[PDB]
Design a protein around this ligand. Sequence first.
Ligand SMILES: CCCCCCCCCCCCCCCCCCCC(=O)NCCO
Ligand SMILES: CCCCCCCCCCCCCCCCCCCC(=O)NCCO
Ligand SMILES: [Cl-]
Lengths: 135, 135
Amino acid sequence: HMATVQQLEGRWRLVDSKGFDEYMKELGVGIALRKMGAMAKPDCIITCDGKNLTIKTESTVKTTQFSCTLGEKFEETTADGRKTQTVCNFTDGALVQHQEWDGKESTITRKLKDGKLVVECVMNNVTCTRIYEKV
Amino acid sequence: HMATVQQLEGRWRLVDSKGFDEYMKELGVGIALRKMGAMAKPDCIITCDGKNLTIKTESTVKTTQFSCTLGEKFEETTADGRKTQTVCNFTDGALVQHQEWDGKESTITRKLKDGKLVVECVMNNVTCTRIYEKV
Ligand SMILES: CCCCCCCCCCCCCCCCCCCC(=O)NCCO
Ligand SMILES: CCCCCCCCCCCCCCCCCCCC(=O)NCCO
Ligand SMILES: [Cl-]
C-alpha cells in the first residue's frame, strides 16, 4: 500500500464467508433465496476505467435436485425450498414426477420428442413447457 | 421402439420456455427468486442406473451488479431486489460502496489483504466478511 484501484481489477473467487446468512437476514432476504445465496461460489469481476467502475458477479449453482429409486416415494427438497412428498415413475416412455406438499400438488413430465427433452409442468390450472437440447 | 430411460440420460440444456414464470408463481415463489429463475439457463443432468435415478441441475448466472463513476450517486438494482441510492468512493486504498433505501443503509467496503480481496458488508449491527482469491 497505498493500493491503487488497478490493484483491485480482475476476477476474484470466493474462498471464505462469515456471517453472510445473518447479513442477508438483516436486509430482509427470505429463507429460500438465502440458502441459494449461501450455496453459490460467486466470482466477482471488477474493472475501473479512470473514475468509471463496473462490478459483475458470475455464480455457478451446481446442485443435486434428488436421488431416488423409481416407484419409491421420498421427501424432496426443491430449489424454491418446499419439502414435498415425491414419487417418480418411468411410465409409457416418459419420466413422471409427482409432488405432494401442504395438500397442494404438482406433476412434472419429461419426454423425448425429436431428440429434444420436452419438460412439462402442471399445477392446478397452470402449465409450463421447457425444451432442452442434448450437450 | 418407444423411449427408454437410458434414452433420457445425459446433459440437456434449456433452449425455450413457455409459462415458467406463472408456474413458479403458482408454487408460491417470491418475486425476487422468480426473476432469477427466468434469468438462468440451466443445464439438466439426468442419470439412471436401471432403477436408481438422479437429476442434477447446473446454471451459471452472469449479472452486472452495477456500473458507475466514483463519487457520483446512482440508482442500484441489487440481487435481492432492492432499489438503492448508491455511491462508490475509493478512499485510502479501499473501495467503499454505500447504499441508501427506505431510511435504511448498508456499506460494502472492498480491501486488499495479502493479495486477497476482503469484502466486509455492514448493515446496522450485522457484519459479514467474505474473502476472495485472484483468478
Ligand atoms: C458475491 C455476492 C452476490 C451473491 C451471489 C448471488 C446470490 C443470490 C441472491 C443473494 C441475495 C443477497 C444479496 C445481497 C448482496 C450481497 C453482496 C455483498 C457480498 C459480495 O461479496 N458482493 C460482491 C461484490 O464484491
Ligand atoms: C430448472 C430451474 C432451475 C434454475 C436455477 C435457478 C432457479 C432459481 C429458483 C428456482 C425455483 C423454481 C423451482 C421449481 C422447479 C420446476 C422444475 C422446472 C422443470 C425443469 O426444467 N426442471 C429441471 C429438471 O428437468
Ligand atoms: Cl418463461
